[PDB]
Design a protein around this nucleic acid. Sequence first.
DNA 1: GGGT
Length: 213
Amino acid sequence: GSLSDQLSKQTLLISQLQVGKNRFSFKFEGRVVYKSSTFQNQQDSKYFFITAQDANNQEINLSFWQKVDQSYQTLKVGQYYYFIGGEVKQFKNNLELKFKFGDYQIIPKETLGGSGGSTLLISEVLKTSKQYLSVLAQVVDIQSSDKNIRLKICDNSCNQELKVVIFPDLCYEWRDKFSINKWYYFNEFVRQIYNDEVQLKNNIHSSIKESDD
DNA sequence: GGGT
């Protein structure tokens, strides 16, 4: 089930998909050309769908019925991904890929083979020259604005606080969801320098997860 | 399961 095992699987174009293939016997490369809203009727059964384009400029509908929130945040129009674990299913004269089991994988092609999500420590972060990294740190200061959140994060390997800037797209979904002294994973941020003090910044690939501890 |  390793990532490298999943990337092993044969890549297929829309014209090659068959209903009789096992959901995990292939992987599909797709460019997101359209992303719907999340739909919600019931106390908890949200869905959404995207339109993905392949290398023949053909387009196919992908529906997501589980792990909806995470996947909705991952998928951005314009980006290329590998999708693994979807059921090829008939869609009225068409085929579609249907993601229902919550063990499917959406792998962004761009960050493929990078240490961006390597999850190091603040004192380390403040020492290492990577440009993309991830910290499990604690929020000790919050300056929240119209379009931008400035944080100061700290950890137990230093007495220094790290400065973190969060920009439009990702900040909206976080404007007042930060708690002081709570613990968060800052995945795939951008090491950067202003005043020979080192800001972390987010970009299109960044994510944030609240350590449940 | 569900459905644009």
